[PDB]
Design an enzyme around this catalytic site. Sequence first.
Site, PDB file in Angstrom:
ATOM      1  N   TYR D  53       0.848  -1.185   0.000  1.00 37.12           N
ATOM      2  CA  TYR D  53       0.000   0.000   0.000  1.00 37.12           C
ATOM      3  C   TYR D  53       0.889   1.243   0.000  1.00 37.12           C
ATOM      4  O   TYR D  53       1.938   1.266   0.640  1.00 37.12           O
ATOM      5  CB  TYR D  53      -0.971  -0.009   1.190  1.00 37.12           C
ATOM      6  CG  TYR D  53      -2.077  -1.043   1.171  1.00 37.12           C
ATOM      7  CD1 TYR D  53      -2.293  -1.875   0.075  1.00 37.12           C
ATOM      8  CD2 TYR D  53      -2.941  -1.175   2.257  1.00 37.12           C
ATOM      9  CE1 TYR D  53      -3.301  -2.827   0.075  1.00 37.12           C
ATOM     10  CE2 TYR D  53      -3.970  -2.110   2.264  1.00 37.12           C
ATOM     11  CZ  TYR D  53      -4.138  -2.955   1.173  1.00 37.12           C
ATOM     12  OH  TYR D  53      -5.124  -3.928   1.158  1.00 37.12           O
ATOM     13  N   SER D 215     -13.464  -5.027  -1.552  1.00 31.45           N
ATOM     14  CA  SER D 215     -14.205  -4.437  -2.664  1.00 31.45           C
ATOM     15  C   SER D 215     -15.689  -4.649  -2.434  1.00 31.45           C
ATOM     16  O   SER D 215     -16.395  -5.150  -3.307  1.00 31.45           O
ATOM     17  CB  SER D 215     -13.778  -4.982  -4.016  1.00 31.45           C
ATOM     18  OG  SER D 215     -14.346  -4.218  -5.081  1.00 31.45           O
ATOM     19  N   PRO D 216     -16.206  -4.255  -1.246  1.00 24.35           N
ATOM     20  CA  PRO D 216     -17.598  -4.533  -0.905  1.00 24.35           C
ATOM     21  C   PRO D 216     -18.659  -3.758  -1.700  1.00 24.35           C
ATOM     22  O   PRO D 216     -19.850  -4.121  -1.659  1.00 24.35           O
ATOM     23  CB  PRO D 216     -17.674  -4.169   0.589  1.00 24.35           C
ATOM     24  CG  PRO D 216     -16.540  -3.210   0.829  1.00 24.35           C
ATOM     25  CD  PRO D 216     -15.473  -3.534  -0.192  1.00 24.35           C
ATOM     26  N   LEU D 217     -18.239  -2.670  -2.381  1.00 29.97           N
ATOM     27  CA  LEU D 217     -19.137  -1.909  -3.243  1.00 29.97           C
ATOM     28  C   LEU D 217     -18.783  -2.159  -4.706  1.00 29.97           C
ATOM     29  O   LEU D 217     -19.176  -1.385  -5.557  1.00 29.97           O
ATOM     30  CB  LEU D 217     -19.033  -0.409  -2.931  1.00 29.97           C
ATOM     31  CG  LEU D 217     -19.290   0.045  -1.489  1.00 29.97           C
ATOM     32  CD1 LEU D 217     -19.466   1.554  -1.419  1.00 29.97           C
ATOM     33  CD2 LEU D 217     -20.507  -0.625  -0.882  1.00 29.97           C
ATOM     34  N   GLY D 219     -15.939  -1.726  -6.329  1.00 27.75           N
ATOM     35  CA  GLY D 219     -15.157  -0.634  -6.883  1.00 27.75           C
ATOM     36  C   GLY D 219     -15.983   0.641  -7.079  1.00 27.75           C
ATOM     37  O   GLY D 219     -15.709   1.399  -8.008  1.00 27.75           O
ATOM     38  N   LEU D 221     -19.327   0.715  -7.815  1.00 27.27           N
ATOM     39  CA  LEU D 221     -20.507   0.479  -8.639  1.00 27.27           C
ATOM     40  C   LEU D 221     -21.803   0.351  -7.832  1.00 27.27           C
ATOM     41  O   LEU D 221     -22.871   0.639  -8.374  1.00 27.27           O
ATOM     42  CB  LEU D 221     -20.277  -0.798  -9.457  1.00 27.27           C
ATOM     43  CG  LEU D 221     -21.190  -0.987 -10.671  1.00 27.27           C
ATOM     44  CD1 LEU D 221     -20.845   0.031 -11.760  1.00 27.27           C
ATOM     45  CD2 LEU D 221     -21.078  -2.406 -11.214  1.00 27.27           C
ATOM     46  N   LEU D 222     -21.726  -0.131  -6.579  1.00 25.55           N
ATOM     47  CA  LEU D 222     -22.905  -0.359  -5.739  1.00 25.55           C
ATOM     48  C   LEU D 222     -23.126   0.819  -4.778  1.00 25.55           C
ATOM     49  O   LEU D 222     -23.933   0.716  -3.843  1.00 25.55           O
ATOM     50  CB  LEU D 222     -22.731  -1.660  -4.926  1.00 25.55           C
ATOM     51  CG  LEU D 222     -22.658  -2.971  -5.713  1.00 25.55           C
ATOM     52  CD1 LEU D 222     -22.109  -4.104  -4.850  1.00 25.55           C
ATOM     53  CD2 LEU D 222     -24.020  -3.358  -6.286  1.00 25.55           C
ATOM     54  N   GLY D 223     -22.399   1.927  -5.004  1.00 25.60           N
ATOM     55  CA  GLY D 223     -22.413   3.078  -4.109  1.00 25.60           C
ATOM     56  C   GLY D 223     -23.228   4.257  -4.652  1.00 25.60           C
ATOM     57  O   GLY D 223     -23.029   5.378  -4.225  1.00 25.60           O
ATOM     58  N   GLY D 224     -24.183   3.989  -5.550  1.00 23.49           N
ATOM     59  CA  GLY D 224     -24.978   5.020  -6.195  1.00 23.49           C
ATOM     60  C   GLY D 224     -24.307   5.568  -7.454  1.00 23.49           C
ATOM     61  O   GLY D 224     -24.356   6.769  -7.705  1.00 23.49           O
TER      62      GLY D 224
END
Lengths: 319, 319, 320, 320, 319, 320
Positions: D53, D215-217, D219, D221-224
């Site tokens: 990182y 990657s729970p959203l 990347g 895409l599932l965050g609005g």
Amino acid sequence: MEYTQLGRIGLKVSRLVLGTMNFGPTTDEAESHAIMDAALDAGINFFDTANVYGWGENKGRTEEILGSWFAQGGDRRDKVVLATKVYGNMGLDGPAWPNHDKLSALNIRRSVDASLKRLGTDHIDLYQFHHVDRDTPWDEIWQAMDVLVRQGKILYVGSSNFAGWNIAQANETAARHGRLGLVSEQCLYNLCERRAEMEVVPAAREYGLGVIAWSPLHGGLLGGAIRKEAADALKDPQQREQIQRYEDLLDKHGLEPGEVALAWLLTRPGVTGPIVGPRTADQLASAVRAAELTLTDEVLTALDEIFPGPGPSPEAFAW
Amino acid sequence: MEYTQLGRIGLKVSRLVLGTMNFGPTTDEAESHAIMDAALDAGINFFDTANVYGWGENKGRTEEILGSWFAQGGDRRDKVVLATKVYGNMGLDGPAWPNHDKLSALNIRRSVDASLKRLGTDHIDLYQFHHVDRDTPWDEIWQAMDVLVRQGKILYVGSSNFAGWNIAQANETAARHGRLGLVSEQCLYNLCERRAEMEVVPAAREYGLGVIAWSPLHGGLLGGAIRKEAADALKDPQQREQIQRYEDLLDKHGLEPGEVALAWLLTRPGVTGPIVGPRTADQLASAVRAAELTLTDEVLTALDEIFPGPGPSPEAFAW
Amino acid sequence: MEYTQLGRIGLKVSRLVLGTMNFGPTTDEAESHAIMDAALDAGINFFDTANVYGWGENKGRTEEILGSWFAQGGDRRDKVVLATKVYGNMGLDGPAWPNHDKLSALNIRRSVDASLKRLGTDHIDLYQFHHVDRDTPWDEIWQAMDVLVRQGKILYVGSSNFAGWNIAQANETAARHGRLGLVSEQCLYNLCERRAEMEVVPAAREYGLGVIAWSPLHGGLLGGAIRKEQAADALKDPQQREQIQRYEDLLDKHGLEPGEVALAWLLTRPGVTGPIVGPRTADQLASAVRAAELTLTDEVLTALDEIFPGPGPSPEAFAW
Amino acid sequence: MEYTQLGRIGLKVSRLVLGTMNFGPTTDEAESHAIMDAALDAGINFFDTANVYGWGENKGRTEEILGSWFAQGGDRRDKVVLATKVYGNMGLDGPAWPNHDKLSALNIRRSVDASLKRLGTDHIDLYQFHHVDRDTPWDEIWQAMDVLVRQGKILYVGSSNFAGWNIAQANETAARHGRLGLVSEQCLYNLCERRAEMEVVPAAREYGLGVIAWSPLHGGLLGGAIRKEQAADALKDPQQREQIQRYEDLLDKHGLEPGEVALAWLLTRPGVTGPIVGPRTADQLASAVRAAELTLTDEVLTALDEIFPGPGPSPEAFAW
Amino acid sequence: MEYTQLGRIGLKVSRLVLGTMNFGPTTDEAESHAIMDAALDAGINFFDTANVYGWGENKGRTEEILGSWFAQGGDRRDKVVLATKVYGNMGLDGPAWPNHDKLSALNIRRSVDASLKRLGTDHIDLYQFHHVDRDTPWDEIWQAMDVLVRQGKILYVGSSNFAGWNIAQANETAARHGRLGLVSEQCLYNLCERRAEMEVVPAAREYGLGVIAWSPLHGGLLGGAIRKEAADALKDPQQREQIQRYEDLLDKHGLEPGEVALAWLLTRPGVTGPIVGPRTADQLASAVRAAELTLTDEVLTALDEIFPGPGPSPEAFAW
Amino acid sequence: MEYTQLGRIGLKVSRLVLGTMNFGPTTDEAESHAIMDAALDAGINFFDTANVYGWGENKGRTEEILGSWFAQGGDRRDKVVLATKVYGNMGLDGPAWPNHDKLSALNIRRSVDASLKRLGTDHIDLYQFHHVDRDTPWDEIWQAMDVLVRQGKILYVGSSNFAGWNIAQANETAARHGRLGLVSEQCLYNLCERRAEMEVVPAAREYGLGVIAWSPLHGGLLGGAIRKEQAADALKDPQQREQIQRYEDLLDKHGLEPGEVALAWLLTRPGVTGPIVGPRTADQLASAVRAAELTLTDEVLTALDEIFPGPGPSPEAFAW
């Protein structure tokens, strides 16, 4: 005939495995016997059956037909690697009575005893789970199988319709106490359905299992199903176009779709070979030609274009 | 009928266990056979007996009555999980001859052989110690049981009337050399007597044993013993008032004390289910209704007030 | 002074265990030191402490008092079997921050480092779990403890407030990979509270643990509590006072001290190494030394057992 | 804050995992520190980093930012379950010099020393493999990791991006010689990408690993993602936009935030410890805290499952 | 009759062990049967024999006499702990044919089969090595014994005429793979010969073996051999005076030398009890009285003066 | 100089063992040093000491004399197989304080630290138990010894004054978990005292231990004790003097030294590594070197055996 070791073990098998599922329902006793004799003469020594084969209230019949085949002598039992299965309900279809399906030590004890009687032999060479049973632990299962091994009633244990982690857990449990673990996995693997490549075949290869592919023509669909005017794939135009591209490619190169479906599996890393289920002597001759058939890199390349594989996990879905 | 796995193992059992202790002394052969047939039709597959059942100079009779039941065919032996026991003196009551009770490899060898003969079967499904024997070590006991397992004469081993530490020591000894350990414990557990909750049931749950509760009505006392005008509890006014509060509560909600005693056990964490010992077909129908009965949180709450449990050790007596 | 082996192991200990929880809350440093020197002089070699001892904002104080005692030299550290404990929240009283109580390998690491610092020593002889943690597996716990053994930071591992089945699971897991398991269990056990007999003491005896009885006078109730009305809740209950009354009366008749008898009784129980003697002054030690020279007659043991019946071993306790 | 055990082990962790990959590339030291203090305040104790990182020429920067955070004292190191990773090339981007990536005992040794230096700490709590290395045997890997456990440099070992069969092989090999195996798997798992269900999550549950979803959203895409058109490639595909559209529309109807729902969904899946919350600002943390207090109705779960069907467990996924 | 556990195991035995060595050569079949019946009625359940007992070309006869005893029924086989031995040459005396003596897996297989036939039983309770064989390794020996254990033909294994280190090596080898090790050692131990105390009895006690003392009267010499006018000790005046002091002491206290020799052994730490070999019913009654006899500390003290023991190694010869 | 392997292991040792117990009580530092240099010169590489050597208030002195010898450099430490011992009370003569003798892990830890300090070395090659401790279990003892092996403080473990069954129990326990067991037993064994033959020497040979004979002249009795009347209690007994007389007379006839013969005899016994040569002056060493070049004839061995009969192996010794 091409021969190979069954995974890591000392047993040598033909690359074609003779499936017996048609013996009883489709092919009569006498025709079945002749096909098994033709198989021997083509050099096929590896015969697969199951207690449930026969179906309905006729489950067991296939095993009986092998039983009567062995009873003719002429070294038939002696030269065959006899494989059967345990897991399936052997009563009337519908909800099984408790412990009359699945892989409890109780079901294994009763299933093997009935199988041995129907097969008219004192031992099975390869005794295979028909499916994973996640409710039975491996110390229970290996207890059951080891009883049979020490009585001389089975030699080897194999699997069918397992996940990769079940193969690992199985073989690790076995090795802990010196026991020979699974020697083979029988999985659904063909051009249309390649998800066995994610984890099942990687695990099998890591643990030295032979890999045996069932439904190698995806239930007919890869055997020229368009030319001759499984069914559910033909209605979906996405999959229909896939097979159309398949058949068109094979016309061009002058090859039978039946035969290449089998030869393709014989090229895949870790694959022992396909199960072939002839209903006649002529379907058997055709399987033998498929075993001889060399596919070019060019054809291999285009099959992969039409029928892409997912690759191993985790790369198939992550990186 | 509700089914559950027996602890961690692959064996599926009815939540009611059919006790057979009345078959012989109270119920005659013919009536016993009919009750076992009614049990099968209600879906009960799990049958419990013991070599000593019959009592007096009639010890063994109960096992013989199951033996004659199996001899009628119709898949009776095949569909039952047959449980029996070893430990008890099978000679005349009083001081046993040495090694004719308890759990020496000698007593296990002679007890199982007599049990198998009386039951007219070649194998017992679940062979249970009737009591802990602190004078026999676990390497001796597991030797004895493994002989039987490898001969095909038993499948599973269980316990009865053990302390929690005996369950742990047993299963740890077994696992060390790859052997399947105890799969179940049969303990005295009911509303009046809840000390099994201190260590027996915690250990059983930790080690994946099924828990089977015997004396589920505390010898009748929870079956409406006041309304109908065990005995020693009725004289002590402290315990008498306890049962009176019990019966009064159940009148109010319109429930049978027989049935709730059983349904209460079916709510306890880790409990496979109670042993029910009907002497008639109508006592069996009543047990089946108890298995269906849902008890409300309100009733569950008030039972706990009247019949408080000690909690797990060490919290039950320390912190 | 009477000595015994701690359970199955090679370590010899006094049958009297010096408990230190009063050092700090009740007894100050200098007075604490005097008691520990008097314990040595009486031949007591087995000293029990805990990280939490000190109480409230002073948790750690008892450990510090032992540390300052050792810093004086004079063979003190060398003569003593030093025991301390892990499990308890060492922060603000109330719900602990996660992994700052209980028996995770994380809390074991941090708890032992702080204990070694306060004790001003490079090793603990007997490192004990203060209570069972049912959410931590034994392969985790034995990992943490074996790290410490290999670095030389502890020698022996013990428990406190376990169930019998926890003792068996611990020692079976250890033995599977060569490790020495629990060597001792510290359980609540006295005339009034005898349920350790059901399974805890049977399990300890089977696995060869020493059994150390804490709260041996049941919080003062067996120490002449009625006569010294010139534990609080016990005396309020009629039936329990009745029980203590008969106790005090019986000892009057035989000319025996309640304080000494409660300990001498424990010294008779099978598998019991000894009681925790927790002194606030020099008197508790001398009293305990007198307790250990006492021979109770079969008549007194019989009468004690009528007054204070025990459950016996399970399964017989609740069944047959 | 909701807590759980990490799989089968004694370690308690927040169901929200603080991911640190934005610390350095996006968020600077001082702002990174503020988020980590806000995480403590919200009761998040589980901090996830990696050696790689930082990115490009700044690989190591995130580890350094945690190190400077710990150097401030105030119980920071003591409160945190510190996780980091090995496998990745720490040199110039491009093909690594041999044994300077992957999981040889050689790379494990060098990678952990550099991580401990940058983190300015003497121990890592959870040391995780960033990816499976199929050319390194488990007796090699467990050798390297057990050296570190015995020296006190790590406590627990975890994985990331394994196959199910790799988890079983790891933990069976460990257990054969007493060692504590993998305690956690960090897998890619969200509404859009559900193939971890086939074998990875089943294997983890069987061996008692925590399951941490990265990657729970998917990347972003599932965050609005559609509404905020005022992941890139996904929105270009017609069929995938269709899927997200239905998602956004359904949440409109129910009055729910896409960002919170994607995480709350994961909190419902069997065996899932929790998602990686990777903040760039204080907003991601608070959003995640709200996600964890959300109760999704069976109607919403049902609809989500119609839109985002999963494969189910193998062999049934591809056969029967 | 006094009973005790046989070392650490679950088997309960009478403190007197009935030796059968006189049955055949000295006592006829019919008299032997009556003595065994009298033994049962006195509560003796533990019977010791050997394949070689009978001697000469009559080796095996003693085992046959027990065989014919069991064939009468009345629960004779069932209530006895049957012990026999392996090691001895069963052909003509002189140099044995190779592998027809000692403890090779070959000799164990042939000896047990002949023993089982002569005893007319399907299992031996306690199968004992008659002597250590330092040329056969313990992985070979335990292989042989475990075959028999898993076939149900023996229950327990014991030793006779071993050194202490052989007991340790044996039991450690057994435990390594989960097998129950030696449960008893039969050693020469009596007032005149106490060197078993150096290492044999310490090892036996450490490893939880029962200790059984053979030649408990040192071949007669402790049975009042002076009063009645073994032989080699009477010529040596040093040993003669020892026995004279013995007999004089026992006159004074009014006790039979036969009986105290046995009672003395029953006081020694770790000793299960002596083997008693009656040739008649009256010699058996006398052994039973010896089992009841309490010896005073005063008598115990003076026996130790006359018959000092060497103590444990290394203290017996170093410090 | 004759060399052999120590039992089954890879270590080569002189068949003469340099015993040091006279260094301190009899022979001072400087003279002790001269003997140790003469031992090196004769090719003796195997030096045996003990913590207790020195005697009374000077226990530890012998260890200190070796330490000052090593401090001179000149490859001394590097050339020597250094053996020392634990078990004995190092305090005031009399009953030891608990755990300050015997073989608890506690006494092992403290005893080895003090031995390393006095010897002025960071490692002992062969660390031996001076006597059997029947109250300490082998899992305890092997724990303590394996800690030391892993830290590099000892290499090999040996015994002294064990029973045969103690040797088997030790080495079986070690081997169960991979550990190298006892490599040597030091037993009392000479012409006069032959009972080590019954079980100790048989057990050692079976487990591949070296056998080191201490008191090889039976406390001087076999060293020409009668002729040098110009051990004390032995010469007073008529029957024992008779035995020694025949010995001395037989050696007169053959022209052989009693001092050399007693050692040469031991060099002929099966499984015997060699005798302890304990010098007070340079004479004992040279005498022993001459003993080791001696070939005793079958006639002399035969006669020695008539005079000094042995018991043979048990069970035959007392039975058949």
